[PDB]
């Protein structure tokens, strides 16, 4: 099965070249919009792009782009969007692609600062009573309230399109304790978010994909998207055993790039799968 396998590449100390191989077979899509000139300070980094065929468009006339991608899983039955953390001037497109594509669910794998270096800006509320407004979005949020676990928070946000007075209830699932060096020892903390972002209905069908982002919705954002894709996998096709982690992570590559962003994390992703089926066993 699958902790064999893990053996396998354990007692090999092959992990790196298992990342290094699946880095060789990655899929490789233009992102021409990205590339424009008129987008360069929509990107945080100028090496991870969204590829063109899989882009969220924002319903705007301006200027449509946001560095987001569509995975969609179609075996899975889930679709995730992935993307970078937002940027000082990128909210409210942020907020915005919440409310066009109907998220109840925003899942965050980072801190804003990380070791001296910004990952992503203050892009929500931190006081119930200062509310956030995006001018150029049109877009009101509001903290309304938050739980604050060991090692992770759960926030519950009202954004409110000041356009319609329509407001809808946003789901924050914020992971606060992820490691300076490394990644977790133990999956058991990463499985539980994952197990309570499921629990709260952001995943299901009835609503848009949940948006995940980290510091440029690669590395983490992989790591939590691979993770719950191969679970439901292995809870689908009745020969569980079948489910291979590289080839579901070479189909999500096709979406967006570099996901899983070091060989430790692609080690973790196995850890976390692996656990979370045998407690779920």
């Known amino acids: 099965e699958m902790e064999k396998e893990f053996e396998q ?3 090999s100390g092959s992990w790196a070249a298992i990342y290094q191989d699946i880095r060789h077979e990655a899929s490789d899509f233009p992102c021409r919009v990205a590339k424009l000139p008129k987008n360069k300070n929509r990107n945080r980094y100028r090496d991870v792009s ?3 065929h899989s882009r969220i468009k924002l319903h705007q006339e301006d200027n449509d782009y946001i560095n ?3 995975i969609k899983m179609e075996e899975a039955q889930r679709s995730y969007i992935l993307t970078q953390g937002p940027l000082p001037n990128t909210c409210g497109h942020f907020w915005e692609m919440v409310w066009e594509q109907k998220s109840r669910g925003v899942v965050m794998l980072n801190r804003v600062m990380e070791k001296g270096s910004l990952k992503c800006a203050q892009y929500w509320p931190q006081k119930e009573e200062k509310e956030m407004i995006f001018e150029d979005t049109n877009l009101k949020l509001t903290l309304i309230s938050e ?3 060991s090692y992770y928070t759960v926030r519950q946000l009202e954004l409110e399109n000041l356009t319609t007075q329509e ?3 946003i789901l924050h699932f914020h992971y606060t304790t992820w ?3 490394g990644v977790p020892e133990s999956p058991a903390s990463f499985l539980n978010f994952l197990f309570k972002v499921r629990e709260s209905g952001s995943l299901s069908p009835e609503h848009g994909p949940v948006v995940v982002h980290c510091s440029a919705g690669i590395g983490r954002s992989g790591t939590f998207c691979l993770a ?3 679970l439901l996998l292995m809870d689908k096709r009745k020969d569980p055993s079948s489910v291979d982690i590289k080839k579901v992570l070479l189909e999500m590559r096709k979406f967006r790039m570099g996901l899983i962003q070091t060989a430790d994390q692609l080690r973790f992703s196995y850890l976390a799968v692996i656990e979370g089926a045998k407690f779920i066993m």
Do not use: Q
């Open 9 to 11: 590449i354990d007692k």
């Open 50 to 52: 969204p590829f063109d």
């Open 68 to 70: 987001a991608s569509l």
């Open 147 to 149: 739980d604050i676990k």
């Open 167 to 169: 407001t809808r209830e």
């Open 179 to 181: 490691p300076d060096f």
């Open 228 to 230: 719950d894709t191969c």
